[PDB]
Write a protein that binds this ligand. Structure first.
Ligand SMILES: CC[C@@H]1C[C@]1(NC(=O)[C@@H]1C[C@@H]2CN1C(=O)[C@H](C(C)(C)C)NC(=O)OCC(C)(C)CCCCc1cccc3c1CN(C3)C(=O)O2)C(=O)NS(=O)(=O)C1CC1
Ligand SMILES: [Zn+2]
Length: 192
């Protein structure tokens, strides 16, 4: 089965919003065939397999997401199923060549420690960077609130890509910190 784009998180306006482009029946069918003729736009896609739904984010012309969501699956596209360009299970990372029509987030060079995590419901959650791949949640959210947002972007105050959300440190169902694949690690994967 292919990963299928079923919506987007629009970030170009004053407030973020989620848009649905495909339902359950459409997603199941598109997954089997791997032929998706829908127009792609924006930076953050909402994606699904048959069993899970999550996010994918374009950075440096590659559409990235989490391995624990996508496995080694192809992504459905206009020309049929497209094989993964990158697969790094140790980083919980996969990527495909960004679909035609998509736009990529610019890598952050600010070195800012105030970050912003975008969820699949288009919430923008402030995150304080605490290391290479960690940020603490200033204001926590329960785990159920963040569920399905893996593969989404962490952004800097200027709206650059800082990383890809992959996991949350859960304490009794509440997330106090988030873990992410930094953009620099994405670049390293693209290099060597
Ligand atoms: C709920 C919002 C979370 C973002 C999110 N991710 C998850 O739910 C991932 C999936 C799974 C568990 N997990 C966790 O976040 C767990 C948790 C909360 C369940 C308790 N936390 C944790 O382990 O902290 C420990 C920590 C050290 C921070 C992990 C670092 C990563 C270590 C690591 C390295 C290499 C490979 C792999 C891992 C972990 N890995 C494979 C893997 O499969 O993890 C999600 O929403 N997923 S989703 O619903 O969209 C799903 C459909 C895609
Ligand atoms: Zn920046």
């Amino acid at each position: 089965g292919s990963v299928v784009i079923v919506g987007r998180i629009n970030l170009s306006g004053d407030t973020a919003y989620a848009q649905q482009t495909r339902g359950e029946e459409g997603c199941q069918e598109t997954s089997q065939t791997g032929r998706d003729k829908n127009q792609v736009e924006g930076e953050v896609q909402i994606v699904s397999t048959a069993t899970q739904t999550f996010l994918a984010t374009s950075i440096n012309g590659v559409l990235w997401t989490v391995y624990h969501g996508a496995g080694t699956r192809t992504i459905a596209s206009p020309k049929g199923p497209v094989t993964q360009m990158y697969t790094n299970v140790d980083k919980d990372l996969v990527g495909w060549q960004a679909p035609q029509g998509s736009r990529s987030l610019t890598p952050c060079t600010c070195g800012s420690s105030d970050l912003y995590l975008v969820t699949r419901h288009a919430d923008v959650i402030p995150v304080r960077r605490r290391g290479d791949s960690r940020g603490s949640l200033l204001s926590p959210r329960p785990i159920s609130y963040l569920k399905g947002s893996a593969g989404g972007p962490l952004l800097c105050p200027a709206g650059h890509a800082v990383g890809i959300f992959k996991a949350a440190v859960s304490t009794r169902g509440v997330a106090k910190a988030v873990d992410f694949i930094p953009v620099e690690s994405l670049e390293t994967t693209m290099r060597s």
